[PDB]
Write an enzyme that holds these catalytic residues in place. Sequence first.
Site, PDB file in Angstrom:
ATOM      1  CE  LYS A  44     -10.395 108.228  84.990  1.00  5.03           C
ATOM      2  NZ  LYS A  44      -9.805 107.105  85.261  1.00  5.03           N
ATOM      3  CG  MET A  70     -10.142 102.383  86.848  1.00  3.57           C
ATOM      4  SD  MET A  70     -10.660 101.384  88.240  1.00  3.57           S
ATOM      5  CE  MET A  70     -11.971 102.841  88.780  1.00  3.57           C
ATOM      6  CB  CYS A 131      -6.624 105.346  78.108  1.00  9.24           C
ATOM      7  SG  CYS A 131      -7.823 104.280  79.080  1.00  9.24           S
TER       8      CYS A 131
HETATM    9  C1  LIG Z   1      -7.458 103.282  89.519  1.00  4.02           C
HETATM   10  C2  LIG Z   1      -6.726 103.611  88.381  1.00  4.02           C
HETATM   11  C3  LIG Z   1      -7.000 104.689  87.516  1.00  4.02           C
HETATM   12  C4  LIG Z   1      -6.125 105.087  86.847  1.00  4.02           C
HETATM   13  N1  LIG Z   1      -6.492 106.389  85.775  1.00  4.02           N
HETATM   14  C5  LIG Z   1      -5.680 107.092  85.189  1.00  4.02           C
HETATM   15  C6  LIG Z   1      -6.200 108.064  84.117  1.00  4.02           C
HETATM   16  O1  LIG Z   1      -7.354 108.662  84.369  1.00  4.02           O
HETATM   17  N2  LIG Z   1      -5.221 108.747  83.478  1.00  4.02           N
HETATM   18  C7  LIG Z   1      -4.007 108.289  83.101  1.00  4.02           C
HETATM   19  O2  LIG Z   1      -3.118 108.856  82.581  1.00  4.02           O
HETATM   20  N3  LIG Z   1      -3.454 107.287  84.371  1.00  4.02           N
HETATM   21  C8  LIG Z   1      -4.297 106.441  85.053  1.00  4.02           C
HETATM   22  N4  LIG Z   1      -4.017 105.553  85.875  1.00  4.02           N
HETATM   23  C9  LIG Z   1      -2.577 105.110  85.541  1.00  4.02           C
HETATM   24  C10 LIG Z   1      -1.875 105.903  86.880  1.00  4.02           C
HETATM   25  O3  LIG Z   1      -1.989 107.141  86.518  1.00  4.02           O
HETATM   26  C11 LIG Z   1      -0.319 105.259  86.855  1.00  4.02           C
HETATM   27  O4  LIG Z   1       0.277 105.880  85.378  1.00  4.02           O
HETATM   28  C12 LIG Z   1       0.053 103.842  86.933  1.00  4.02           C
HETATM   29  O5  LIG Z   1      -1.104 103.359  87.808  1.00  4.02           O
HETATM   30  C13 LIG Z   1       1.347 103.580  87.334  1.00  4.02           C
HETATM   31  O6  LIG Z   1       1.575 104.134  88.708  1.00  4.02           O
HETATM   32  P1  LIG Z   1       1.543 103.233  90.131  1.00  4.02           P
HETATM   33  O7  LIG Z   1       2.511 102.042  90.166  1.00  4.02           O
HETATM   34  O8  LIG Z   1       2.052 104.067  91.135  1.00  4.02           O
HETATM   35  O9  LIG Z   1       0.084 102.715  90.202  1.00  4.02           O
HETATM   36  C14 LIG Z   1      -4.898 104.869  86.722  1.00  4.02           C
HETATM   37  C15 LIG Z   1      -4.386 103.897  87.638  1.00  4.02           C
HETATM   38  C16 LIG Z   1      -5.242 103.155  88.492  1.00  4.02           C
HETATM   39  C17 LIG Z   1      -4.718 102.421  89.486  1.00  4.02           C
HETATM   40  O1  LIG Z   2      -5.046 106.096  81.273  1.00  9.43           O
HETATM   41  C1  LIG Z   2      -5.379 105.134  82.046  1.00  9.43           C
HETATM   42  N1  LIG Z   2      -4.665 104.212  82.729  1.00  9.43           N
HETATM   43  C2  LIG Z   2      -5.176 103.403  83.602  1.00  9.43           C
HETATM   44  O2  LIG Z   2      -4.800 102.451  84.212  1.00  9.43           O
HETATM   45  N2  LIG Z   2      -6.729 103.309  83.678  1.00  9.43           N
HETATM   46  C3  LIG Z   2      -7.304 104.198  82.853  1.00  9.43           C
HETATM   47  C4  LIG Z   2      -8.926 104.089  83.052  1.00  9.43           C
HETATM   48  O3  LIG Z   2      -9.017 102.860  82.618  1.00  9.43           O
HETATM   49  O4  LIG Z   2      -9.578 104.985  83.477  1.00  9.43           O
HETATM   50  N3  LIG Z   2      -6.789 105.054  82.299  1.00  9.43           N
END
Ligand SMILES: Cc1cc2nc3c(=O)[nH]c(=O)nc-3n(C[C@H](O)[C@H](O)[C@H](O)COP(=O)(O)O)c2cc1C
Ligand SMILES: O=C1NC(=O)NC(C(=O)O)N1
Lengths: 312, 312
Positions: A44, A70, A131
């Site tokens: 995370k 988040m 983010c």
């Molecule tokens: C629950 C949630 C929390 C996430 N937290 C992070 C994060 O901590 N750091 C980050 O770089 N991306 C975070 N992301 C973004 C994901 O890493 C990813 O880039 C984004 O969801 C797109 O991919 P997907 O279409 O497979 O969901 C988060 C996404 C979601 C759904």
């Molecule tokens: O880089 C992030 N991408 C996301 O979609 N969510 C978060 C987060 O809010 O923790 N951070």
Amino acid sequence: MCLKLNLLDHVFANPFMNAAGVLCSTEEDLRCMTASSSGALVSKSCTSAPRDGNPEPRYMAFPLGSINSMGLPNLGFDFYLKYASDLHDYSKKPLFLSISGLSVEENVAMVRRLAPVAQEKGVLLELNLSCPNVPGKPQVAYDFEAMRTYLQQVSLAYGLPFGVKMPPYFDIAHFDTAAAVLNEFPLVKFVTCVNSVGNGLVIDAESESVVIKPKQGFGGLGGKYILPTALANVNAFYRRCPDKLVFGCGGVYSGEDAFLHILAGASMVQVGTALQEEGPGIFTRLEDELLEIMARKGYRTLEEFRGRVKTI
Amino acid sequence: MCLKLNLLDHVFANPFMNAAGVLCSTEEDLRCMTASSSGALVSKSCTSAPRDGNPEPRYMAFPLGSINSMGLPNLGFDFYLKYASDLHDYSKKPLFLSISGLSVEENVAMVRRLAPVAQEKGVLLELNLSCPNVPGKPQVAYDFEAMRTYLQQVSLAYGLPFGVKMPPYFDIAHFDTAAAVLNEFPLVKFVTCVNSVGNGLVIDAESESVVIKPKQGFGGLGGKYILPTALANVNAFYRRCPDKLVFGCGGVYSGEDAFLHILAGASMVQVGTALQEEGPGIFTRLEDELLEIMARKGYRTLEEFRGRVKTI
Ligand SMILES: Cc1cc2nc3c(=O)[nH]c(=O)nc-3n(C[C@H](O)[C@H](O)[C@H](O)COP(=O)(O)O)c2cc1C
Ligand SMILES: O=C1NC(=O)NC(C(=O)O)N1
Ligand SMILES: Cc1cc2nc3c(=O)[nH]c(=O)nc-3n(C[C@H](O)[C@H](O)[C@H](O)COP(=O)(O)O)c2cc1C
Ligand SMILES: O=C1NC(=O)NC(C(=O)O)N1
């Protein structure tokens, strides 16, 4: 036929890993990801101090994907550093550690302490410049001067290979500028495209209400909504950063989706929304489905088709 | 119960219209839109001279939406001006004329000639600052200084009320800046959110090829992919521009989707991809579906719920 990769001086059983933020916040989560069939895992995105994150509800999923705000809830850098130093079983798979400081100074503070652990253990830094969910903090890499400053300061303080989690862009001029900035930094060895598509708004028709609480309902989008955007960004940076690796993230639900990311130029393929929804069993399915497509097409390795998308 | 409304000193039978570029390029198209049950129509974004546009294939549709790189194919401003001045039956419904010059000078040239026709006939200008498909021409409104220059010059040359077709934004700071720029211009009476989501990439797994020819496959996205993005933009500008109208565009396939746009703040609701795919029959279905939702909820007017999306 095989899914093996050898990159960044590490060996990976297959290209699949979680997307940062999904199934990777607690020790329990990280052990679960380690026990899965994924080729790697990432922790995370962390900050110097632990964070509760934004008010709930802050994640909602739907047939076409997810919306989240988040707010970087995390156990704090000390915890993820300790996990990388003492707890992670590197014999199982490589570990990436994501950081998302709220300022350049905070990122610098973390990387100064990460460096000796990266040197000793081989944990790989993913620097989050995208983010979209902390109130009052716009995506760093939508400001190209800020992006340069962060990369300059992190490069100097860290001194080791790292990667960058990038926001999606929608403008050819932005692909051009962003990739040029990245190319100024030889320590940037991988580029992860993309983070969630920022500040979308899902509204429930029956209740006439937004579905998440933070920021009046505005949150990052993932899943089916974003696949063509993700593929565009993967390919744009693959083309513009020929001396770096690109990791694909966005809209992966199937081996076919992964195949498209790899055709576009992806080395590793990250899974967010679909993993959040289906759980870590998804990795065996993705592997089976990718291998089936490869078998049908007569591809024996990933390198046989990586980046080989055809244009008209 | 009926969907009739008044806006911009015009009367509309209902809030529905085509999105610029769809079913509005030829005299035939415009007559077809006029004969439909839509509350209004808008012409294809035009340039001073006729354009062939980008090479075909340049539009492809899929279950979740569309990708296009049309490249402003149009019959030229002279034609659309003639349609507005001589051919359109204003007794049927109001007409918007969209312009999309490739420079500020070109837009100025067009609006100087549009002005007398607007004075005589009441045709309404939609200034397109968000075309994402002409090679080497980045979206105007992603450059805030360029945006200000275009609006200053068009305001001075036109001197009459007009509206602006905006690109989608993904960053709170950008919503803030973009809306502040718009608020500098009292002649901007409506803001249309959004144009297509720029520079996505659709890849066909079987052929391993991009699906459109221009720009190595990179094109604007419409349809189901973009609804939460469109709603976010509608609401962001509705909140920030309380003295202007917002027109919603993006991802409308049903009366329920239109209901969401209106909840978010939309006055008019434009239909692109779904209209391209289904044809002008869609307008009777959209009206019926919207009225049904309103009746179920006990709403008698659009004003009762416009912009009334609830937050948590
Ligand atoms: C629950 C949630 C929390 C996430 N937290 C992070 C994060 O901590 N750091 C980050 O770089 N991306 C975070 N992301 C973004 C994901 O890493 C990813 O880039 C984004 O969801 C797109 O991919 P997907 O279409 O497979 O969901 C988060 C996404 C979601 C759904
Ligand atoms: O880089 C992030 N991408 C996301 O979609 N969510 C978060 C987060 O809010 O923790 N951070
Ligand atoms: C075939 C095609 C041509 C378009 N041409 C224009 C154009 O001339 N001017 C403009 O402002 N938008 C144009 N658009 C964008 C649409 O007006 C609309 O903003 C976008 O498609 C999103 O709406 P949708 O989800 O209903 O498709 C075009 C879109 C497509 C599909
Ligand atoms: O403004 C535009 N939006 C689009 O999606 N396509 C075009 C076009 O290329 O004609 N123009």
